[PDB]
XYZ file of C-alpha atoms in Angstrom:
680
model
C 67.017 123.322 95.586
C 67.486 126.909 96.848
C 68.366 130.227 95.108
C 71.909 131.428 94.590
C 73.333 134.845 93.796
C 76.909 135.346 92.197
C 77.071 138.965 93.289
C 79.039 141.976 92.089
C 82.527 142.434 93.353
C 83.336 144.143 96.645
C 84.419 147.564 96.006
C 88.139 148.321 95.819
C 90.296 150.862 97.584
C 87.930 151.728 100.333
C 89.324 151.662 103.979
C 85.970 150.397 105.294
C 83.247 149.203 103.008
C 82.450 146.000 104.468
C 81.465 144.920 108.150
C 79.984 142.074 110.139
C 77.842 141.722 113.311
C 77.621 138.802 115.790
C 75.472 135.679 114.910
C 75.883 136.705 112.281
C 75.561 138.841 109.159
C 78.212 140.213 106.801
C 77.582 143.158 104.558
C 79.904 144.420 101.587
C 79.574 147.450 99.369
C 79.689 146.482 95.642
C 78.952 148.875 93.020
C 75.811 151.068 94.156
C 74.585 148.393 96.660
C 75.433 146.599 99.874
C 75.069 142.773 99.731
C 74.096 140.883 102.864
C 75.360 137.305 103.663
C 74.147 135.258 106.593
C 76.908 133.286 108.110
C 76.813 130.436 110.619
C 73.837 128.004 111.634
C 71.345 130.692 110.733
C 72.263 130.391 106.987
C 70.782 126.739 107.583
C 73.218 124.925 105.182
C 73.588 121.068 105.475
C 76.844 120.005 107.202
C 80.255 120.041 105.345
C 78.639 122.565 102.788
C 79.738 126.137 103.632
C 77.532 127.818 106.278
C 76.661 130.959 104.303
C 73.862 132.353 102.200
C 73.465 135.551 100.221
C 70.159 136.917 101.588
C 69.565 140.484 100.450
C 70.722 143.945 99.148
C 70.499 147.507 100.370
C 69.256 149.440 97.284
C 68.914 153.198 96.979
C 72.371 154.860 96.362
C 72.847 156.140 92.752
C 76.636 155.870 92.722
C 79.476 153.801 94.097
C 79.093 152.891 97.791
C 82.533 154.081 99.420
C 81.721 153.085 103.001
C 79.750 150.678 105.158
C 79.548 150.150 108.811
C 77.097 148.176 111.114
C 75.950 149.545 114.476
C 77.637 147.271 117.086
C 75.323 148.246 119.929
C 73.401 145.245 121.501
C 69.715 145.305 120.231
C 70.554 147.540 117.283
C 72.852 145.152 115.236
C 70.142 145.647 112.544
C 71.170 149.188 111.922
C 74.044 150.119 109.601
C 75.373 153.282 107.630
C 76.684 153.768 104.062
C 78.469 156.468 102.218
C 78.331 156.996 98.542
C 79.752 159.038 95.703
C 76.124 160.242 95.335
C 76.872 162.569 98.358
C 74.720 160.895 100.954
C 75.133 159.074 104.208
C 72.228 156.753 104.697
C 71.039 154.806 107.975
C 69.564 151.522 107.066
C 67.440 148.838 108.940
C 68.689 145.483 107.467
C 65.301 143.791 108.542
C 63.330 145.954 106.217
C 66.316 146.867 103.930
C 65.060 150.464 103.994
C 66.491 153.877 104.869
C 65.694 155.234 108.324
C 67.148 158.569 107.588
C 70.011 160.246 105.843
C 71.928 163.393 105.059
C 73.673 165.160 102.321
C 75.851 167.433 104.504
C 79.188 166.582 102.703
C 80.135 168.625 99.653
C 83.093 166.666 98.509
C 83.510 162.860 97.740
C 83.209 160.953 100.921
C 86.123 158.898 101.947
C 84.693 156.647 104.660
C 82.444 156.463 107.826
C 82.260 154.600 111.120
C 79.448 153.863 113.610
C 80.639 154.823 117.170
C 81.200 151.762 119.319
C 80.315 153.943 122.376
C 77.423 156.206 121.237
C 74.313 154.509 119.944
C 73.149 156.833 117.162
C 76.634 158.456 116.313
C 78.042 158.128 112.758
C 81.344 159.845 112.051
C 82.177 160.438 108.212
C 85.190 162.130 106.510
C 85.709 163.494 103.026
C 88.504 164.055 100.348
C 88.953 167.775 101.605
C 89.292 166.880 105.281
C 85.764 167.695 106.349
C 84.315 165.510 108.977
C 80.678 165.227 110.005
C 79.555 163.860 113.326
C 75.823 162.821 112.753
C 73.641 161.730 115.724
C 70.856 160.243 113.600
C 68.292 159.729 116.278
C 68.132 163.156 117.825
C 68.547 164.845 114.250
C 71.909 166.653 114.939
C 75.157 167.142 113.303
C 78.509 168.925 113.749
C 81.058 169.536 111.033
C 84.805 169.485 112.082
C 87.919 170.399 110.183
C 91.079 169.249 111.279
C 93.731 169.521 108.554
C 93.391 170.260 104.763
C 94.238 166.747 103.487
C 92.418 163.798 101.999
C 90.873 161.525 104.717
C 91.585 157.779 103.835
C 90.444 156.155 107.151
C 88.684 156.984 110.308
C 88.100 154.884 113.519
C 86.201 155.938 116.530
C 87.743 154.739 119.833
C 86.098 151.596 121.383
C 86.801 153.141 124.882
C 86.284 156.775 124.802
C 83.157 158.237 123.192
C 84.799 161.420 122.147
C 87.982 160.081 120.496
C 88.312 159.486 116.829
C 91.465 158.421 114.970
C 91.958 159.797 111.408
C 94.430 158.712 108.737
C 95.275 160.712 105.723
C 96.566 160.214 102.095
C 100.087 161.715 103.024
C 100.416 159.431 106.091
C 99.473 161.776 108.742
C 97.505 160.184 111.672
C 95.737 162.265 114.312
C 93.628 161.614 117.400
C 90.960 164.159 117.827
C 88.301 165.017 120.573
C 85.106 165.550 118.926
C 83.706 167.373 122.081
C 86.446 169.987 121.817
C 85.733 171.139 118.131
C 87.986 168.311 116.892
C 91.060 169.421 118.680
C 94.046 167.318 117.886
C 95.048 165.497 121.104
C 97.844 163.354 119.564
C 99.702 163.962 116.256
C 101.173 160.712 115.295
C 104.115 161.433 112.970
C 105.940 158.539 111.223
C 104.210 157.096 108.229
C 105.310 158.513 104.746
C 102.464 157.288 102.624
C 98.594 156.617 102.712
C 97.107 155.382 105.888
C 94.913 152.358 104.928
C 93.695 151.184 108.391
C 93.451 152.322 112.033
C 92.834 149.672 114.745
C 92.631 150.717 118.580
C 94.001 148.047 121.111
C 90.756 146.479 122.162
C 91.600 146.572 126.050
C 91.738 150.020 127.779
C 95.237 150.867 129.341
C 98.689 149.492 129.155
C 95.361 153.479 124.880
C 97.268 151.827 122.195
C 96.581 152.304 118.348
C 97.972 150.375 115.243
C 98.032 152.013 111.805
C 98.585 150.133 108.396
C 100.161 152.122 105.454
C 100.978 151.850 101.887
C 104.606 152.542 103.227
C 104.564 148.822 104.219
C 104.812 149.311 107.877
C 102.344 148.759 110.767
C 103.137 151.271 113.590
C 101.673 150.656 117.054
C 101.597 153.897 119.026
C 100.974 155.024 122.505
C 98.411 157.848 123.641
C 100.088 157.807 127.278
C 103.457 158.644 126.035
C 101.988 159.909 122.698
C 104.960 158.326 120.830
C 105.689 155.284 118.510
C 106.458 152.110 120.466
C 106.597 149.549 117.662
C 107.270 149.468 114.009
C 106.456 146.183 112.025
C 107.735 146.150 108.401
C 105.911 143.700 106.064
C 107.922 140.527 105.057
C 109.007 139.670 101.535
C 107.430 136.246 100.751
C 107.307 134.145 97.494
C 104.166 134.837 95.580
C 102.000 131.628 95.722
C 98.806 130.300 94.058
C 98.252 130.251 90.344
C 100.141 132.543 87.946
C 98.153 135.861 87.718
C 98.019 138.320 84.981
C 101.112 140.701 84.881
C 98.935 143.178 82.766
C 97.221 144.610 85.915
C 98.642 147.307 88.087
C 98.877 146.553 91.974
C 100.642 148.307 94.856
C 100.003 147.394 98.504
C 96.757 147.667 100.615
C 97.754 147.313 104.309
C 94.518 146.604 106.549
C 94.304 145.514 110.084
C 92.201 143.502 112.488
C 92.882 143.702 116.174
C 90.972 140.657 117.795
C 89.256 141.931 120.974
C 89.588 138.481 122.470
C 93.350 138.179 121.817
C 95.027 141.638 122.473
C 98.520 140.170 121.842
C 97.739 139.232 118.273
C 97.267 141.539 115.317
C 96.051 140.487 111.752
C 97.206 142.244 108.729
C 97.035 141.990 104.987
C 100.367 141.953 103.067
C 101.782 141.894 99.549
C 99.649 139.901 97.040
C 96.949 139.624 99.727
C 98.663 137.153 102.021
C 97.126 137.360 105.504
C 99.447 137.533 108.610
C 98.869 136.910 112.277
C 101.378 138.986 114.193
C 102.565 138.011 117.670
C 102.826 141.235 119.477
C 104.596 139.612 122.571
C 107.636 139.158 120.158
C 111.278 141.124 117.203
C 108.577 140.651 114.497
C 107.122 137.171 114.714
C 104.152 136.451 112.276
C 102.123 133.318 111.282
C 100.865 133.147 107.647
C 97.330 132.245 107.041
C 96.862 129.156 104.854
C 100.467 128.250 105.215
C 99.912 124.465 105.265
C 97.259 124.311 102.477
C 98.118 125.433 98.920
C 96.042 127.720 96.410
C 93.576 128.930 99.282
C 95.162 132.345 99.747
C 94.142 135.521 98.078
C 96.151 136.232 94.835
C 95.931 140.021 95.006
C 95.823 142.698 97.760
C 93.171 142.500 100.491
C 91.146 145.660 101.371
C 88.996 144.743 104.366
C 88.890 142.362 107.209
C 85.775 141.859 109.297
C 85.546 139.602 112.342
C 82.418 137.467 112.785
C 81.753 135.355 115.842
C 78.871 132.736 114.933
C 76.088 131.687 117.268
C 77.923 128.341 117.728
C 81.020 130.194 118.939
C 83.274 129.878 115.863
C 85.703 132.764 115.371
C 85.683 133.733 111.728
C 87.306 136.631 109.782
C 86.060 137.651 106.435
C 88.449 139.139 103.726
C 87.598 141.228 100.503
C 90.261 141.419 97.817
C 91.108 142.763 94.422
C 91.011 139.147 93.328
C 87.223 139.334 93.404
C 86.778 136.558 96.118
C 85.347 137.004 99.524
C 87.024 134.419 101.845
C 86.032 133.334 105.355
C 89.022 132.339 107.589
C 88.716 130.062 110.587
C 90.953 131.948 113.210
C 91.452 128.765 115.160
C 93.242 127.061 112.251
C 94.007 130.182 109.925
C 92.562 128.025 107.157
C 90.056 129.209 104.648
C 86.579 127.782 105.505
C 85.064 129.076 102.152
C 85.192 131.374 99.298
C 82.314 133.461 97.597
C 83.406 134.526 93.967
C 82.057 137.657 92.441
C 81.647 139.376 89.044
C 83.434 142.652 87.899
C 81.335 143.342 84.756
C 77.985 142.598 82.984
C 77.086 138.998 82.887
C 76.655 138.808 79.053
C 76.333 135.199 78.319
C 75.631 131.798 79.896
C 76.168 128.379 78.415
C 75.757 124.863 79.902
C 78.037 122.197 78.683
C 76.175 119.147 77.103
C 79.294 116.951 78.034
C 79.985 117.980 81.532
C 76.464 118.358 82.927
C 76.028 121.456 85.115
C 79.296 123.043 84.025
C 78.104 126.678 83.299
C 80.311 129.178 81.371
C 79.806 132.865 82.001
C 80.915 135.670 79.782
C 81.696 138.780 81.943
C 82.653 142.294 81.085
C 85.820 142.179 83.400
C 87.583 140.085 80.717
C 87.561 136.727 82.513
C 85.515 133.723 81.525
C 83.982 131.945 84.612
C 83.135 128.177 84.647
C 80.696 127.419 87.570
C 80.464 123.788 88.495
C 76.899 124.275 89.485
C 76.336 120.546 90.759
C 79.395 120.607 93.109
C 78.017 118.701 96.064
C 79.953 120.434 98.979
C 80.179 123.963 97.220
C 77.362 126.176 96.057
C 79.842 128.621 94.315
C 82.588 126.443 92.746
C 83.850 128.860 90.183
C 87.032 128.786 88.158
C 88.447 131.754 86.319
C 90.076 131.838 82.880
C 91.898 135.153 81.911
C 94.711 134.197 79.439
C 93.988 135.563 75.852
C 90.637 137.026 76.969
C 91.300 140.696 78.041
C 88.279 142.340 76.619
C 84.567 141.903 77.566
C 83.313 138.335 76.843
C 79.969 138.790 74.954
C 79.485 135.233 73.560
C 80.356 131.531 74.609
C 79.397 128.277 73.304
C 80.697 124.930 74.504
C 81.627 122.228 71.873
C 78.767 119.718 71.776
C 80.942 116.541 72.269
C 84.583 117.533 73.246
C 85.221 118.026 76.934
C 86.719 121.352 78.112
C 86.344 123.001 74.663
C 84.958 126.539 75.004
C 84.527 128.863 72.097
C 84.343 132.615 73.104
C 83.793 135.964 71.535
C 84.635 139.586 72.661
C 83.528 143.150 72.424
C 86.613 143.867 70.212
C 85.572 141.164 67.731
C 87.862 138.459 68.865
C 87.064 134.763 68.590
C 88.734 132.206 70.663
C 88.724 128.513 71.580
C 89.724 127.693 75.310
C 90.670 124.173 76.501
C 89.452 124.581 80.127
C 90.973 121.143 81.114
C 94.445 122.584 80.515
C 96.552 125.578 81.624
C 97.472 126.473 77.896
C 96.299 129.915 76.663
C 93.393 129.777 74.168
C 93.739 129.619 70.323
C 92.651 132.810 68.731
C 91.107 133.378 65.278
C 93.373 135.475 63.010
C 90.243 137.036 61.449
C 88.457 139.584 63.693
C 84.865 140.949 63.372
C 84.850 144.790 63.161
C 82.362 144.904 66.063
C 81.294 142.735 69.108
C 80.847 138.967 68.677
C 77.202 138.418 69.782
C 76.780 134.794 68.856
C 78.738 131.646 68.600
C 77.303 128.403 67.126
C 78.706 124.992 66.245
C 77.462 123.407 63.028
C 78.364 121.281 60.057
C 81.055 122.957 57.754
C 79.773 124.379 54.445
C 81.742 125.153 51.395
C 84.507 126.159 51.149
C 85.393 124.432 54.312
C 86.601 120.823 54.302
C 83.702 117.469 62.010
C 82.054 120.730 63.266
C 82.757 124.123 62.166
C 82.550 127.252 64.523
C 80.109 130.130 63.463
C 80.559 133.643 64.782
C 78.369 136.538 64.265
C 79.493 140.074 64.825
C 77.494 143.290 65.185
C 78.717 144.641 61.793
C 76.618 141.779 60.253
C 79.033 139.094 59.135
C 78.968 135.412 60.067
C 82.432 133.815 59.880
C 83.012 130.055 59.520
C 86.059 129.000 61.441
C 87.996 125.779 61.425
C 88.472 124.892 65.067
C 91.642 122.991 64.323
C 93.187 125.804 62.230
C 91.769 128.802 64.180
C 94.882 130.891 63.083
C 94.078 129.850 59.457
C 91.391 131.238 57.226
C 87.974 132.014 58.256
C 85.097 132.325 55.662
C 82.447 135.051 55.415
C 79.393 132.673 54.552
C 77.684 135.472 52.442
C 79.619 134.333 49.463
C 78.146 130.885 49.716
C 74.753 132.362 50.411
C 74.899 134.797 47.404
C 76.088 132.080 45.027
C 73.714 129.317 46.026
C 70.715 131.700 45.779
C 71.884 133.971 42.883
C 71.560 137.327 44.911
C 72.270 140.815 43.320
C 71.382 143.484 46.013
C 73.441 143.736 49.171
C 72.705 141.014 51.764
C 71.182 141.907 55.148
C 73.207 142.704 58.204
C 73.217 139.402 60.252
C 72.649 139.941 63.898
C 71.929 136.400 65.098
C 72.799 132.785 64.090
C 71.051 129.632 65.393
C 71.433 126.160 64.053
C 68.455 123.637 64.258
C 69.286 120.720 66.772
C 69.595 118.231 63.816
C 72.343 120.360 62.241
C 70.414 120.578 58.902
C 68.924 124.066 59.072
C 70.615 127.385 59.907
C 68.580 130.500 60.912
C 69.985 134.026 60.633
C 68.289 136.855 62.210
C 68.902 140.319 60.654
C 69.138 144.021 61.637
C 65.823 144.725 59.865
C 64.080 142.029 61.768
C 63.818 139.363 59.191
C 64.770 135.819 59.901
C 66.119 133.676 57.049
C 66.065 129.919 57.061
C 68.852 128.055 55.094
C 69.234 124.338 54.369
C 72.411 122.277 54.121
C 74.619 121.392 52.185
C 74.930 124.754 50.573
C 72.762 127.158 52.579
C 69.913 127.317 50.173
C 67.231 129.857 51.326
C 63.924 128.106 51.945
C 62.079 130.626 54.093
C 62.010 134.235 55.093
C 60.160 135.116 58.201
C 58.982 138.611 58.339
C 57.558 139.224 61.829
C 60.029 141.396 63.804
C 60.543 144.892 62.580
C 63.634 145.534 64.568
C 67.048 143.834 65.080
C 67.029 140.169 66.036
C 68.767 139.535 69.317
C 68.061 135.856 69.876
C 66.873 132.859 68.163
C 66.441 129.365 69.677
C 65.117 126.033 68.066
C 63.195 123.622 70.403
C 64.982 120.449 71.480
C 64.443 116.967 70.128
C 63.665 114.839 73.173
C 60.042 116.260 73.860
C 56.817 114.063 73.788
C 55.874 114.836 70.037
C 58.565 114.977 67.309
C 56.846 117.999 65.662
C 58.176 120.275 68.441
C 61.861 120.451 67.065
C 60.447 122.456 64.230
C 59.331 125.194 66.695
C 61.773 128.334 66.536
C 61.536 131.140 69.185
C 62.856 134.605 68.390
C 63.311 138.023 70.109
C 64.150 141.391 68.788
C 64.457 144.995 70.112
C 60.551 144.922 70.431
C 59.056 143.183 73.456
C 56.798 140.850 71.751
C 58.197 137.338 71.299
C 57.293 135.018 68.425
C 57.388 131.350 67.818
C 57.353 129.999 64.179
C 56.662 126.408 63.264
C 58.805 125.351 60.256
C 57.785 121.757 59.845
C 55.581 122.421 56.718
C 58.113 124.609 54.930
C 61.203 122.454 55.816
C 59.433 119.207 54.854
C 58.252 120.599 51.560
C 61.870 121.693 50.689
C 60.766 124.414 48.155
C 62.901 125.042 45.021
C 62.056 128.776 45.700
C 61.796 130.518 49.075
C 58.438 131.031 51.060
C 57.673 134.228 52.985
C 55.969 133.615 56.254
C 54.306 136.751 57.794
C 51.956 135.214 60.537
C 53.372 133.783 63.797
C 52.604 130.249 65.158
C 52.356 131.790 68.717
C 52.699 135.254 70.081
C 54.014 135.990 73.465
C 53.246 139.490 74.879
C 54.033 140.751 78.242
C 57.474 142.257 78.308
C 57.938 146.043 78.103
C 61.407 146.276 76.584
C 63.814 144.440 74.363
C 64.328 140.717 74.487
C 68.047 139.814 74.744
C 67.764 135.961 75.089
C 65.209 133.150 74.929
C 65.752 129.456 75.624
C 63.399 126.331 75.622
C 63.163 124.090 78.817
C 64.881 120.784 78.164
C 62.411 119.312 80.616
C 59.131 120.455 79.027
C 57.211 120.586 75.758
C 56.907 124.287 74.542
C 58.046 125.920 77.708
C 60.282 129.071 77.025
C 62.120 131.512 79.129
C 62.902 134.989 77.996
C 65.250 137.691 79.330
C 64.359 141.221 78.922
C 65.562 144.868 79.419
C 62.406 145.362 81.364
C 64.507 143.786 84.390
C 62.546 140.409 84.410
C 62.836 136.976 83.080
C 59.506 135.377 81.980
C 58.670 131.730 81.712
C 55.919 130.984 79.200
C 53.925 127.959 78.117
C 54.612 128.865 74.530
C 52.038 126.478 73.090
C 49.137 128.008 75.074
C 50.573 131.557 74.929
C 50.274 131.596 78.758
C 52.615 133.484 81.036
C 53.523 131.383 84.135
C 56.201 132.916 86.247
C 58.064 136.355 86.180
C 61.479 136.686 88.069
C 62.154 140.098 89.411
C 65.228 139.514 91.411
C 67.610 141.439 89.211
C 68.036 145.127 89.568
C 69.611 145.488 86.118
C 68.616 144.613 82.441
C 68.776 140.882 81.643
C 71.238 139.864 79.102
C 71.165 136.003 79.304
C 69.178 133.130 80.624
C 69.697 129.275 80.656
C 67.595 126.505 82.115
C 69.327 124.254 84.646
C 70.081 120.884 83.089
C 68.764 118.808 86.040
C 66.140 120.774 87.864
C 63.022 121.661 85.873
C 62.132 124.364 88.364
C 65.521 126.213 88.321
C 66.800 128.869 85.906
C 70.079 130.951 85.711
C 69.863 134.561 84.547
C 72.608 137.274 83.960
C 72.303 141.074 83.788
C 74.089 144.381 83.699
C 73.675 144.543 87.422
C 76.875 142.373 87.401
C 74.921 139.457 89.026
C 73.971 135.997 88.094
C 70.884 134.736 89.831
C 69.913 130.893 90.190
C 66.227 131.063 90.915
C 63.138 128.739 91.277
C 59.913 128.925 89.145
C 57.937 127.825 92.120
C 59.144 130.593 94.458
C 58.051 133.532 92.284
C 55.187 135.789 93.386
C 54.148 137.031 89.925
C 52.811 135.254 86.737
C 53.708 137.975 84.366
C 55.942 141.132 83.803
C 54.968 144.549 85.157
C 52.422 146.680 82.895
């Protein structure tokens, strides 16, 4: 197929950190980057499927990107400007995705910036102390201005007059200044009594008029001729609609505006709960609600930004960013949602494909919500459902039940273990017993004494593996060390267990330990049959090869990764088949896979090949290996962060999913990669 990126969430509480240009292209600030999305025919998606594609990233800021604005000058729609908490304003060329030039003139946290509609190379930025910089980037010039000693929230250069800029402040003051007269205040618009979130100029000259949106829940339309206020629209109270959100998050209003240049008598605004309104300015406060006819397509939390985009084929679209972590595309003709692009608010810690519902991919995320991505949805490349009830903390482990549809085990960084029924709206069952530290692994396997068809095993960072009864999760959970210690007559303290992996046949359990050893236990009683001494640092990942390969000998292969970069495969046919009455120590690998330059977080065997392994590393790459020939095939470098998880697509042998601490999940193709091995 084609690649996909589930990106980080658009940044919150920024008056302008997203924009679009005609054709067209949408950009949004998200963490320390800007993400670029082709929208319309140029995306080149098949009909009925949403016409968008995530196509690139602007990389180089070292902190939160606070502002983003395209140039809207014909022939230079490829230029844009960003601001960041790193103290810089950068000018970018989106064709190369590189910096053209930049400045560090601001000495206080930048609030926002805007590219002049009228002057080709002028970018105006404003900071939290009230300082404004005019930057004419192509003649290398700047002017500081200082109007009033207050925190700038928003700034909008006039579309009609090259010298006029409207500024909105944290306290509700709005001013229009003349940047040719040292920022002289030409109009002082008094009326709002809280944060100005948005300023839109009437897009026709004469019929100037100006609209301002505020945390005070009013939109005020003002005159420059008279100077005075000519219209106050108060937001309506409306029934909250969509699925029941989480009370345990704080949320006041964000009131942003879009004044369509082709429809001067209409004004679009956000509203409580992220509803969108089309206001009729001919009328006594008439509005029409976006998505009024359809159900559950509206945003469920406040909307921060609205970006008009006219496509090549003349569709009028409007893009919305929200605290709900969705980017939505609105068809202005109908006010219905054309499509939604979901996003991630934390590290992608864990991926797990359901063996029952093919292509159903669960994602464990550091924003406390489980995602289920229906990866094989025919008409939607990003069909993602969220689960929040009973989760709360960072989801560091997931594992679908092997036979029961909808049954998802999960684990958290506060040691919690849970079992979700994703086919219902009921909250998850939670284990009464907690791990002292993060749950790094979950695995289903046969029950062992004293339990007492499949038990759930959870491994915490403190070193304990618990056996849970998936019926009675609130009941007793058993530390398996007692069974281990008794079956094998152990006297010294047991190793700290850092990883658990059951062989596919459910007859053998492997535990990886903090000291690097891997122990091999046999049912029914977890008799130790083998200790593998190969890694010398904490074991992060173990995986047993599947059973449906060409030769049956392959299901005895076990891959493992530790805090060192070298990966090993061991072949446990001999030892397992001999069933020794006292345990064997293995100290030579069956295969050695060298290439990575940092810790290995996750390994997984291709279900479509014999002895084909993918690994995820803290070196920022995923590596595909022919394990049997010790041959590196394909290195994926699309992540910016350190990889935490990897999983082979169940239907396409060429497609793998990977997650990282860059807040991204990438779906990529082994055939489209330029490198065969990791950087040296």
